[PDB]
Design a binder for this molecule. Sequence first.
Ligand SMILES: [Cl-]
Ligand SMILES: [Cl-]
Ligand SMILES: [Cl-]
Ligand SMILES: [Cl-]
Ligand SMILES: [Cl-]
Ligand SMILES: [Cl-]
Ligand SMILES: [Cl-]
Ligand SMILES: [Cl-]
Ligand SMILES: [Cl-]
Ligand SMILES: [Cl-]
Ligand code: NA
Ligand SMILES: [Ru+3]
Ligand SMILES: [Ru+3]
Ligand SMILES: [Ru+3]
Length: 129
Amino acid sequence: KVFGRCELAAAMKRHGLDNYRGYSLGNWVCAAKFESNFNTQATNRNTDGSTDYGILQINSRWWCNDGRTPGSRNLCNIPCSALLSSDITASVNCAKKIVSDGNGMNAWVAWRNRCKGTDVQAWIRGCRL
Ligand SMILES: [Cl-]
Ligand SMILES: [Cl-]
Ligand SMILES: [Cl-]
Ligand SMILES: [Cl-]
Ligand SMILES: [Cl-]
Ligand SMILES: [Cl-]
Ligand SMILES: [Cl-]
Ligand SMILES: [Cl-]
Ligand SMILES: [Cl-]
Ligand SMILES: [Cl-]
Ligand code: NA
Ligand SMILES: [Ru+3]
Ligand SMILES: [Ru+3]
Ligand SMILES: [Ru+3]
């Protein structure tokens, strides 16, 4: 599923991401925009052999099991395919764990390089929230 901008904002808010660990909703929408272009089915292989999955490009090196990342962890206790569903629940619950691990949203390279420090509220402009 490719979410609309405000559609994703509403889903993220319902699932408790607005201000989670102090990160306003616009930060999360911006991260999803540049990680996946709002496409739940996005997958990208990393040089180390891990793969990033879903709207927030969550990495199999630590967070989910894909059966093909030797020596990796599965800290969200989910198959990586669960991060590709049209229902964003699994991605949100796992993102909450990632952002709580100590480094905040810096875990998302696209957030650090393209969202951090910017006017992220623009990503929720016009949305009925
Ligand atoms: Cl579409
Ligand atoms: Cl559409
Ligand atoms: Cl929309
Ligand atoms: Cl859009
Ligand atoms: Cl719309
Ligand atoms: Cl957009
Ligand atoms: Cl846009
Ligand atoms: Cl594995
Ligand atoms: Cl933080
Ligand atoms: Cl990234
Ligand atoms: Na894994
Ligand atoms: Ru469309
Ligand atoms: Ru729209
Ligand atoms: Ru758009």
